[PDB]
Amino acid sequence: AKNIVYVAQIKGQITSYTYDQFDRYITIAEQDNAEAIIIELDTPGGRADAMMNIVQRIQQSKIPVIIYVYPPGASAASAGTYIALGSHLIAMAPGTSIGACRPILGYSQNGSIIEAPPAITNYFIAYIKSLAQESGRNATIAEEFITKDLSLTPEEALKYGVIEVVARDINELLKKSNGMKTKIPVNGRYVTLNFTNVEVRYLAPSFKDKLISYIT
Amino acid sequence: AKNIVYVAQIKGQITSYTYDQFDRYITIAEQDNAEAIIIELDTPGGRADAMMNIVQRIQQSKIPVIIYVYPPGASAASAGTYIALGSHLIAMAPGTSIGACRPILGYSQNGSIIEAPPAITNYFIAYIKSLAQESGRNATIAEEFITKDLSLTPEEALKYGVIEVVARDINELLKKSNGMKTKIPVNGRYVTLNFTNVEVRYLAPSFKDKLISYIT
Q1: Angle at CA B51, nearest 5°, toward B48 and B57?
Q2: A201 and B204 in contact by Cβ < 8 A?
Q3: Nearest-CB residue to A200 (from B197, B200, B204)
Q4: Long-range contacts of residues B137-145, Cβ cutoff 8 Å, at least 24 apart
Q5: Which residues in chain A have Cβ-Cβ distances shorter than 8 Å to B196?
Q6: Most CB atoms within 10 A, among A57, B50, B137, B160?
Q7: CA angle (B51 as vertex; B58, B60 as ends), nearest 5
Q8: Are the Cβ atoms of B169 and A71 closer than 8 angstroms?
Q9: Contact check, Cβ <8 Å, B200/A204
């Protein structure tokens, strides 16, 4: 396991395409046999099924996946919260948000907003509790992301034990995450993070990415 | 020449100690035979002689020295402007400042501020013009840092040709600086910047640094 961290960005709505991005990035770092991949996340939500695919990809990752809510002013909201909860380590930049996972179903008329039945609401509730329980995070706050449309500032998040590192940039993330233990196992093994002599590689989107980012 | 960029921070007043830091960092990257060293600068000024020492160290560096005014809200003011002007490439983060190089000599009574005679003012004027001319930067704006106590926002700076890259973070600096040519030579040779496959190493202050940073 090389001491080499990868960094990549994921921004915008979560789609089937977002899964392709997460998969592509996690693989490159997997191939190369990395220490970790940091994914800078900024999402107002998106598709449930793509989200659940991403959470699985991350849960099944051979290297630890750090979800970093970044840059300042980003949010990991609705679907992006689960991605974050499903991860080996969450960091948040100052000025960012996590939560606000109230499920709506769509839009009714000229001006309205349709609330989801309790049946499917109870699924996501229980889905989020489990991600939270699984990782050793605040299952009780997690649920509130849904039940009380609850959002969190980074300082709250870390105090409630919802996230682990608050960091201004990738250098400070790497400093404050050194000798941290992943909140979930990696291919069967808990991993203890070692960013002492670490070299960082930054991955860029593709031209296809930017195009879909334009359209969507 | 390895494709490996170093990153280090320099913050606070410029002293004899600041020179030791600049020298230490530039050497490590020199030893290792780097592509470049990025120095994140945040200074309200300091000692003239330490500044002139630093400018020389940078001018005489075997690898390109990128001065990055960073983090947002930092400033490269009075002495820090010359360090920046003396460099192979200046970048500025959004929300930062450059200039305000009016030389004062000290403080007079209970409440006052002593202006410097024209004799020594004309030296710094001509010193700054030359750094600016030498590098292919706005000699005419540079002088104004002194004559009209002139400060610049990053967008101004880059439009006046005072700096070269505006960048939110080290990843964006590295993106936007790719295939840029140093504004001054490196050990006799102009260098053209190549951050394609580049691995980043981050250098931390020492415990001695932090102590002097406390006292001063």
Answers
A1: 145
A2: no
A3: B200
A4: B137/B85, B137/B161, B137/B162, B137/B163, B137/B183, B138/B162, B142/B85, B144/B99, B145/B81, B145/B98, B145/B99, B145/B100, B145/B101, B145/B102
A5: none
A6: B137
A7: 20
A8: yes
A9: no
Place of tokens 């879909």: A212
> Strand, coil or helix: what is A195?
coil
**Parallel, antiparallel, or unpaired: how do β-strands A89-92 and A65-69 relate?**
parallel
Nearest to A199 among B71, B174, B199 (CB): B199
Give this entry's resolution in angstroms.
2.3
Q: Which residues pair with A37 in a beta bridge?
A: A6, A65
Helix/strand/coil (H/E/C) assignment for every residue in A56-110: HHHHCCCCCEEEEECCCCCEEECHHHHHHHCCCEEEECCCCEEECCCCEEECCCC
Element (H, E) at B199: strand B199-202
Beta-carbon separation of A71 and B202 below 8 A: no
CB contact under 8 Å between A4 and B199, yes or no, is: yes
Breaks (C-N over 2.5 A) in chain B follow: none
Cβ-Cβ contacts under 8 Å, B167 against chain A: none
Beta strands at B199-202 and A199-202: parallel, antiparallel or unpaired: antiparallel
Our CA-based measurement puts residue A56 at a distance from the nearest CA of chain B, in whole angstroms, of: 28
Superfamily for domain range B1-216: 2-enoyl-CoA Hydratase; Chain A, domain 1 (3.90.226.10)
Report domain extents, chain B.
Answer: 1-216
DSSP state string for A33-50: T-SEEEEEEEBS-B-HHH
Chain B: residues touching A (Cβ < 8 Å):
4, 7, 71, 168-171, 174-175, 197-202, 204
3-state secondary structure of B197: coil
Contact B182, B194 (CB under 8 A): no
